[PDB]
Symmetry: D2
Subunit: 292 residues, 4 copies
């Protein structure tokens, strides 16, 4: 399966007690495939509230997403953790389910050396036999990987490239220059246009769960050099994203899904579980203005 193009970072529907709501999760998967018209789903990322969940819950989500998606789209499994044994267990399970690639966040909390980081990727790859996408998110992890360091990771032929949720466009250019055959997915939806201008191969985004139509337009128009139109659509997109961030990122994407009849559920504690009535009214304004 071609892993280029537009991937939603899959949100998960939770019940009030924090358990997975399977019906709701399935409705989110279907909405992304049928209505957002994504090329793929990136499952178990930050957006899936993954790091607040048990290993069993993470397995449940992988199972559900794949059973619902079947073979209609590409599927990437984020299996990274501070616990390398958990990552390997999850990696094996997603690979056995048929996920097209794994991805793994750089290990965090502790200050791991680069050799420890490389061994972590190499271990998951060896144990699973699957492809690997390096998940880079400096603003959450505090981990910054340089161009030489990416080169060392890329010595393993099963590393396909990087989910680049980072704002350094000089690094972004140098990585494309140095490793032209390795892939890059942009991770900041509000910076899609300038990333696409530097030749990234796709994008993985939480806002694509509701704004997938615009996201594809910006990407395809930019690659075609229709910059004036791409920019107009990036401007509207970012008015919507600005509102979503101000109101509460995951809760507001979910409220926007609910407004279209998707049972997107609660957020998982210790995140705030439910929007206040004021913020629900704010999310309705965003719906009326940008997604009607």
């Amino acid at each position: 399966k071609n892993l280029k193009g537009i991937f939603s970072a899959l949100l998960v529907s939770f019940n009030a007690d924090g358990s997975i709501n399977e019906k709701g999760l399935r409705q989110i998967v279907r909405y992304n495939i049928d209505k957002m018209k994504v090329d793929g789903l990136y499952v178990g990322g930050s957006t899936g509230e993954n790091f607040m969940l048990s290993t069993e819950e993470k397995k449940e989500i992988f199972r559900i997403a794949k059973d619902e998606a079947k073979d209609e789209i590409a599927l990437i499994a984020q299996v990274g953790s501070v616990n390398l044994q958990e990552a390997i267990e999850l990696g094996k399970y997603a690979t056995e389910l048929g996920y097209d690639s794994l991805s793994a966040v750089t290990p965090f909390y502790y200050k791991f050396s680069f050799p420890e980081i490389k061994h972590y990727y190499d271990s998951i790859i060896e144990a699973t036999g699957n492809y690997m996408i390096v998940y880079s998110i400096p603003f959450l992890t505090g981990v910054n990987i340089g161009v030489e360091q990416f080169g060392e990771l890329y010595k393993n032929p099963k590393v396909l490239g990087v989910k680049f949720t980072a704002g350094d466009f000089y690094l972004l250019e140098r990585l494309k220059k140095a490793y032209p055959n390795h892939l890059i997915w942009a991770g900041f939806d509000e910076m899609m246009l300038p990333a696409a201008s530097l030749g990234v191969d796709g994008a993985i985004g939480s806002t694509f769960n509701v704004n997938g139509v615009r996201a594809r337009q910006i990407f395809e128009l930019t690659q075609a050099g229709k910059l004036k139109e791409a920019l107009e659509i990036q401007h509207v997109t970012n008015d919507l994203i600005e509102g979503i961030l101000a109101n509460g990122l995951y809760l507001t994407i979910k409220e926007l899904l609910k407004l279209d009849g998707v049972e997107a559920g609660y957020c998982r504690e210790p995140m705030t579980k439910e929007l206040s009535s004021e913020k629900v009214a704010f999310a309705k304004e965003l719906k009326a203005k940008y997604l009607s």
Copy 2:
């Protein structure tokens, strides 16, 4: 029980495959009680390599540590996690095992609001019925709590105080001024003297597993106003700690335990699991210089 004084942050003995070495873990516990003469153990913190382990492995460690220490010292169980349901489950287990207080790291990775942080602490306390010590470690978590926010957390009468592994001595003084009946444990071993000079109630440290004799001397002498002797002991201690840090923190403390007949074992991947031979020899030099 009295929770003041010197607490070692308990290191864990791992086998080559990353499983727990029960024999070796009870030896580290014994060495702390009998040879380091600590007031208590802080179990499942950063030093215990806790964040790289499964829920079951964390329970095992709590079980073994309590089974060995019995009633002889104070015991604090660090149960914090990005997963609040895990924290609750661990908090209940440790309470049922008889731990004298719980402690929990501020939830990390995601950027949680202060009301979400307070709700996390209040939830663990309500579910367990046990005491709580806030674990503050900004250099790992990126989370900074202010004096006013501590005041809000301390509105819950079961919050005893804070493990302050933080380098802001202005904040430290302000907290002791503002909340005189609440406890503070210093978390940076290499700054014990200046922290004790500001009236902290004890210390929780990784190096006390091997340097617990000097650590008690710095603390007790500083409190008695014997600054001359305390400083001399802090200088030697920091020669040892500078060496430990340069050679590899958890591995070098484990090696120093091994040199005293304690089966401290390997570190847990994704941490480097054993020292290079040259670094083994460096730790033997530290042992000769500072701990024989």
Copy 3:
């Protein structure tokens, strides 16, 4: 004069004792106009080694640059300082010489409040009667100005816009969306393409003193939607910039000028004043690969 387009941040030629070499400075001005084909010069910026100089030296550079350039190109005078009285003295002098606009760095070193920063700009504008361009360079100053704050600055109708030497492309987009008639000049030469993709109005850059031909090509091709070609030229440009940064930015640009018969002189202490012979040889390789 039109202030859009390509502006070199003017380097200055120093003698061995740190005094201005007039003959060399005029050669630099001429090279930029006649060979780099710039739209204008930005005089007295970081690149001019401005902050290491006396007030009289800054005035002599303004005087010389303007006498050499006459009315052939646009000229912007950076007059910012921690000293507001100095900034006003320089602003008046540059305005009297006929500079097309002033620019001023946000006052730095001390942690100024935003109302202090706004008063600083309004004060320079009132005293001089000239236009003003806000010079934003967070990586040197530690000052970060937000969208709402730019709006307060832009309440003064003499503020034309901002020199944006910063790497936050979400802010960049939001600024162009919120204040579409105010101008933005890109300040990071190695990020020109993605900046131009978002509709910046020009660029101010140190490397344009030698790479002005390619810099204009990237900028014009990007705005025309010729991204494939713009990206190829940005990749070569960045191979050159990477080498310049590794070798020493100001000295290396001066070395590349010298190789074309421009007497670009020494750098000013406390910067290193001269390249080593090894680094001169390195600059010759850059010349042979990228500028021959």
Copy 4:
């Protein structure tokens, strides 16, 4: 002259137009000598609003301060600048006025290399013949100097030690261990007690202009091992400092000087030049609570 002990960082009296008020500056010098009973004065540092002034103004301040103080106290002249030629000119002037030592902030704004920083210090020392105190203020300058780097600076026998306006007590202890004969002055007044516990040789502080009685008490009680007493006085001191910081640091110290009859005047633009009315009243409350 003995340079150990308590040094006020001299505040400067400005007129409404920003010019030096000589009468007010002499009154501040007198008040420090006669009422605060300081060991000495640190002239031309951040507290003196130095970096917002012209070279001539800085000279006037140095001349006036020495003329007023004569030989009654120690005097240190801060002459550092991004302009090394200015630093040398200022250093020569203060030296020939008879200042007991010079001091110089690490060059800032530009990202200077360590050999450039060392050459800056050696150059000022060579040109003046005077002793040098390294002025380290990381939170303003972003410059961090390590133990080994201080060793390299200390190879010049005229480098006496460091004004440590920094929060790292581990570094503080290491520097005192490594270079026992070199001096350290604490730069943060609100952390005087823990700095004194680690054996610093004195303190240089802005709040000593108004609170030098308690400052000397904390320093001396701490050095005698009377910690419970020192801590009490440190608590009251930090209540006053917390108020001062919240109300506006330099303006509020100046208001407290004015409330004791000293014509401490305005601050210099671009700093806010006078307190708002409500903040005048708050400063009055500080006077009544802590300095009456």
